[PDB]
Ligand binder design. Structure first.
Ligand SMILES: Nc1ncnc2c1ncn2[C@@H]1O[C@H](COP(=O)(O)OP(=O)(O)O)[C@@H](O)[C@H]1O
Ligand SMILES: Nc1ncnc2c1ncn2[C@@H]1O[C@H](COP(=O)(O)OP(=O)(O)O)[C@@H](O)[C@H]1O
Ligand SMILES: NCCC[C@H](N)C(=O)O
Ligand SMILES: NCCC[C@H](N)C(=O)O
Ligand SMILES: [Cl-]
Ligand SMILES: [Cl-]
Ligand SMILES: [K+]
Ligand SMILES: [K+]
Ligand SMILES: [K+]
Ligand SMILES: [K+]
Ligand SMILES: [Mn+2]
Ligand SMILES: [Mn+2]
Lengths: 342, 342
């Protein structure tokens, strides 16, 4: 069990219902790095950039390989850092390192000196049987001996999306967090990140549509970025609805969504609309034990009515990008994929 | 002093701060009727339909002569009632009768058996020197004897608008009500009501513009009619701003105004907006001691910053109509006006 606490009051509050204390790196990009070390050298197996930010369990985040936003300069650091760790820890086989990038700054989240659940995905993306190799390394056959020394960077985009069990436990708030709840994952391959994500998204059983009306109800910290997303949704032909505070901000930017009522506000309210299959998309971000408990109805309704929803703005952006792609336009075999690698 | 109470709780409330009790005729048209009685006949001097509903003092209302929305059928009833009254009360010279029309039904508000302040405006509009005629009647010369026996209905519209002293007492809520606060009045002459109104309004020192951004903030009981008004302003080329509840209503009608925060809501709020010259027009209707006192800010700011504002929906419609006219287009002299009378 892990929880994110925002203020002093919040602290106690936890403590009640309730030890390591760690500063929470807000508005940070989470990254996964799987590599192999034989004591001589380090092979970077893969650098994966999570769509959802730090604060949403890596196991429940979608991810990209290669990274789709991160600078080469920054990857390189992470790359260097790993290597440092790999030798220091005396890693012999597979390892995994999780970072957080905030303000062009690389922070260390943790190091797992073993095979991580990311391995298979990378293996598939890169064509390198990381598990086998590392195995061979563990048994005494160096990377140099294996002829696996250079890090592979694929020509295409490899996106991993997860599947959540919420529909099996309705009394639960289908909301992301620091604790992992997913049971499985899917993989999307595309020429473009937008194409890969669209494949992964569909693959994950999403009910996202390429039209209709979107509901936007984001948290403060997001109110500022929501604008561009609304704009993207608007470019696509979506009609917008928005709750008070978010409508305010949109409006202030030249965007007038249709104002909707919260549940305790009037009628109809969001639940009603959701229920009536008024939406095709819902973006809903929240921050705070209270804010969360209070928005619980949106999410529960959304899940129940099968409306694709995102609980992260990062995730909303990706959903948006993918509207530009066509998941059924082109198919490629794993064999072909791997053949494309130089 | 006079006040309008809405519910039991409201009654006590008043009582505290605080007797003739009268049912208030909501959503009713107020009408003024000036006439002369010589004991033999009754001369209808004029039938003036106010713009502002009953509840807003006749002295503080703009008015039209002739009526601009009242059926001939209904007027005729009021004309017959005035007659009945004239003879019954024994009037000899001037009289004024006040009615309220609600649901096609004529209701009597009061009878002033003397010269009313509307007498000069009616004389002007009609070319008939009512005070001079009623004076002769009082002195002994009948209507028949002076050859003033038929009611005059001018070929043009005559609108009267008032001037209020709120700008002299800033600590005062510049809102209309059952008590008269106006100091003076102006007259507008036009080929149509819209033209007469425009001239009256301009005449009144209104800072109304034909473009810009309007702010709509209406009461429940008005949220239905507001839509049409919102549309009218839209047709004109105005951009709309509105508060929550209003925005909700407009939204459901397909009109998506730019959301604006009430003062307690956040930022920016109307006060800020008004202060920063964003609006060129304001429509704010309010009902209830509490509702009123809360909305006080809008009105005060509107007056301080010199934005034209209407505190009645009926007023807003009239303002709307006059946007279609040009009060500088054509001028006419009183001698000319009177010469057009047949
Ligand atoms: N300091 C932190 N700042 C932001 N997010 C963090 C922080 N520590 C952990 N997280 C988030 O919580 C997740 C779980 O943390 P982690 O220590 O790796 O847990 P686990 O033991 O389950 O592997 C991360 O994948 C990340 O999204
Ligand atoms: N029963 C009523 N229903 C609606 N409006 C009314 C009613 N009684 C009075 N009013 C409003 O109050 C104003 C003043 O009432 P009135 O009896 O004429 O007082 P005063 O002697 O000052 O003229 C009217 O011009 C009208 O706007
Ligand atoms: N990979 C996380 C699941 C995505 C889900 N639509 C959410 O945003 O909650
Ligand atoms: N006829 C009364 C003055 C009108 C003023 N603009 C108001 O609506 O309050
Ligand atoms: Cl359950
Ligand atoms: Cl004052
Ligand atoms: K993450
Ligand atoms: K761990
Ligand atoms: K009136
Ligand atoms: K009176
Ligand atoms: Mn972890
Ligand atoms: Mn009166």
């Amino acid at each position: 069990a892990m929880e994110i606490v925002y203020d002093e009051a919040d602290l106690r509050r936890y403590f009640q219902t309730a030890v390591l204390l760690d500063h929470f790196l807000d508005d940070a990009v989470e990254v996964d790095v799987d590599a192999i070390c034989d004591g001589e050298m380090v092979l970077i197996g893969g650098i994966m950039e999570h769509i959802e930010q730090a604060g949403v369990h890596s196991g429940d985040s979608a991810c990209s390989l290669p990274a789709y936003t991160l600078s080469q300069e920054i990857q390189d650091v992470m790359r260097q850092q790993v290597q440092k760790l790999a030798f220091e820890l005396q890693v012999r086989g597979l390892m995994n390192v999780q970072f957080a990038v905030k303000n062009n700054e690389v922070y260390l989240i943790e190091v797992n000196p073993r095979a991580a659940r990311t391995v298979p995905f990378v293996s598939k993306a890169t064509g390198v049987p990381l598990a086998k190799v590392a195995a061979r390394v563990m048994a005494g056959k160096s990377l140099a001996e294996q002829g696996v020394t250079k890090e592979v960077i694929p020509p295409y985009y490899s996106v991993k999306e997860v599947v959540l069990p919420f529909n099996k436990f309705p009394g639960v708030d289908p909301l992301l967090g620091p604790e992992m709840r997913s049971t499985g994952e899917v993989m999307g391959v595309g020429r473009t990140f937008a194409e890969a994500f669209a494949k992964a998204q569909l693959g994950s059983n999403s009910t996202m549509k390429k039209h209709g009306r979107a509901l936007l109800s984001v948290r403060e910290g997001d109110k500022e970025r929501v604008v561009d997303l609304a704009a993207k949704l608007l470019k696509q032909g979506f009609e917008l609805d928005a709750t008070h505070g978010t409508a305010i901000v949109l409006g202030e930017a030249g965007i007038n969504p249709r104002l909707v009522n919260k549940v305790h506000e009037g009628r109809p309210h969001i639940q009603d609309r959701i229920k009536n299959g008024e939406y095709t998309y819902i973006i809903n971000t929240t921050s705070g034990r209270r804010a969360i408990e209070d928005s619980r109805v949106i999410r529960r309704s959304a899940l129940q009515y099968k409306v694709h929803y995102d609980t992260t703005l990062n995730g909303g952006f990706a959903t948006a990008m993918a509207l530009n792609a066509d998941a059924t336009e082109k198919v490629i075999s794993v064999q072909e994929m791997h053949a494309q690698i130089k």
